[PDB]
Design a protein around this ligand. Structure first.
Ligand SMILES: [Zn+2]
Ligand SMILES: [Zn+2]
Lengths: 73, 61
């Protein structure tokens, strides 16, 4: 059960939970100003492509935010 | 001059401010054109992140 497209997978799945490089809950919450909460109802896990596709978005939007309002060099 | 990648060529200003949380300046210093790839890549990320927001915090109904 992938949190972001709803599909079910073998180990085509990455954990979001720790008890630093990169941390999904925080990175999601920062970029889109919206948190990701823990029920038994919900899975601890997101699929390889959905996690890949998230950080490809994170990278390019960080790059937009560095540049949008600064004069070229 | 692309406002988003900083290079030369030859709806968005709201949509940016909503998604990320940060306005686009209309300083005369900066140039009110954005590239076809920048524009494409922006809305690819708009669509995909809206889709992630619909699904993140629901058990599959
Ligand atoms: Zn997925
Ligand atoms: Zn560009």
């Amino acid at each position: 059960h992938c949190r972001l497209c709803h599909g079910k997978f073998s180990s085509r799945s990455l954990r979001s939970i720790s008890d630093g490089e990169r941390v999904f809950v925080r990175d999601f919450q920062r970029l889109l100003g919206v948190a990701v909460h823990q029920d038994p109802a919900l899975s601890q896990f997101v699929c390889r492509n959905c996690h890949a596709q998230f950080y490809q978005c994170h990278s390019l939007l960080e790059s937009f935010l560095q540049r949008v309002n600064v004069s070229p060099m």
